[PDB]
Amino acid sequence: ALANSVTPAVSVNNEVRTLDNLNPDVRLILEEITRFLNMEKLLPSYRHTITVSCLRAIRVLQKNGHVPSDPALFKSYAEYGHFVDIRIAALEAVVDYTKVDRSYEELQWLLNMIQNDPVPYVRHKILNMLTKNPPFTKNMESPLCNEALVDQLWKLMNSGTSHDWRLRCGAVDLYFTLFGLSRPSCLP
Amino acid sequence: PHTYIKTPTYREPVSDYQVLREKAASQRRDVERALTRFMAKTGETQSLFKDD
C-alpha cells in the first residue's frame, strides 16, 4: 500500500536525485521501508515476505524519479545464498531495470545467470521474466539489437540449454519475443 | 483538617487508552529505529543513495 501511493516525481532539468531534493512524502515512505527491511534482517518473516515487499517498493521508488536508478542492491539480493523468493523479487527488479535503462551489462549479467546458476528453477524464472517483460520487442529499435546478442541467444537455444528441456523452450520463447518467427532483422 | 488530618495522596494515574497506545507505539518505533541504526552502523552497510 505504501508502494501504491508513489506518484512520479517532478524532476527539473534532469536534476540528479539526491537526498536533499527528495519529496517530503517519499521521505516518510523511504524511512518506513528502511525500518522494515532492516528489522527483517534481524527478525525475519515467514518467507521473507517483507523483504519481497520492500524490494518491490524500492523498485517502485526507482521507477519514478525518487531513488537513483542503481541495480546494485537488487544484484546483491539476487546472489545464490538468499531465499528463493528474495532472489526472484530481486531478479524481477533487475529485469525491469534493464528494460527501462537499456543496460547492456545487466542483460549480460542476466544471460550469464541463466547459463550458470545452481538452482534450475531460478534459471527458468529468469527466462520467464525476461519473456514477460522483454528488454525490447521485434518492433523496437534498441541499442541492444546486435549480431552479438542474436548469436548469444541462438547459441543458448542450440547448445547451453541442452540439459533441461524447460530452459530450451524458455530460450525459444525469448528468441520469439525478441526477434520473431523470421530472420532477426538487426543482422547483415 | 491540616492541623490534624493526615490522609495520604497518590500520583495522577494515566488510564487513557489513546495515550497508552501512543506511548507503546512510539516506544516500540524508537527502540526498533535505535536497534536498526546501531546494527547498520557496526557492520557492512548498503545505501539507496550515493554515500548515504
Swiss-Prot record, chain A:
The name this protein goes by in its record: Transcription initiation factor TFIID subunit 2
Species whose genome carries this gene: Homo sapiens
Coiled-coil residue windows: none
Location of this fragment in the whole protein: 801 to 988 of 1199
Annotated disorder: Neurodevelopmental disorder with feeding difficulties, thin corpus callosum, and foot deformity: An autosomal recessive disorder characterized by impaired intellectual development, microcephaly, delayed psychomotor development, pyramidal signs, thin corpus callosum, and foot deformity.
Subcellular locations according to the entry: Nucleus
More details: PubMed:9418870 was unable to show an association between TAF2 and TFIID.
Self-association state and partner proteins as the record states: Component of the TFIID basal transcription factor complex, composed of TATA-box-binding protein TBP, and a number of TBP-associated factors (TAFs), including TAF1, TAF2, TAF3, TAF4, TAF5, TAF6, TAF7, TAF8, TAF9, TAF10, TAF11, TAF12 and TAF13. Interacts with TAF2C1. Component of the TFTC-HAT complex.
Membership in a protein family: Belongs to the TAF2 family.
Curated annotation (Swiss-Prot), chain B:
Localization of this protein: Nucleus; Cytoplasm
Note: 'Taube nuss' means 'empty nut' in German.
Domain comment in the entry: Ectopic expression of the histone fold domain acts as a dominant-negative mutant resulting in differentiation inhibition.
The protein's name: Transcription initiation factor TFIID subunit 8
Induction or repression: Induced with triglyceride accumulation.
Functional note: The TFIID basal transcription factor complex plays a major role in the initiation of RNA polymerase II (Pol II)-dependent transcription. TFIID recognizes and binds promoters with or without a TATA box via its subunit TBP, a TATA-box-binding protein, and promotes assembly of the pre-initiation complex (PIC). The TFIID complex consists of TBP and TBP-associated factors (TAFs), including TAF1, TAF2, TAF3, TAF4, TAF5, TAF6, TAF7, TAF8, TAF9, TAF10, TAF11, TAF12 and TAF13. The TFIID complex structure can be divided into 3 modules TFIID-A, TFIID-B, and TFIID-C.
Native source species: Homo sapiens
Linked pathology: Neurodevelopmental disorder with severe motor impairment, absent language, cerebral hypomyelination, and brain atrophy: An autosomal recessive disorder with onset soon after birth or in early infancy. Affected individuals do not show developmental progress, are unable to sit or walk, do not acquire speech, have poor visual fixation, and show poor overall growth associated with feeding problems. Additional variable features include seizures, spasticity, and joint contractures. Brain imaging shows hypomyelination, thin corpus callosum, and cerebral and cerebellar atrophy.
Similarity annotation: Belongs to the TAF8 family.
Domain of life: Eukaryota
Full-length numbering of the shown residues: 156 to 207 of 310
Subunit structure: Component of the TFIID basal transcription factor complex, composed of TATA-box-binding protein TBP, and a number of TBP-associated factors (TAFs), including TAF1, TAF2, TAF3, TAF4, TAF5, TAF6, TAF7, TAF8, TAF9, TAF10, TAF11, TAF12 and TAF13. Interacts with TBP, TAF1, TAF6, TAF10, TAF11 and TAF13. Component also of a small TAF complex (SMAT) containing TAF8, TAF10 and SUPT7L. Forms a heterodimer with TAF10. Interaction with TAF10 is mediated mainly via its histone fold domain while interaction with SUPT7L is via its C-terminal region.
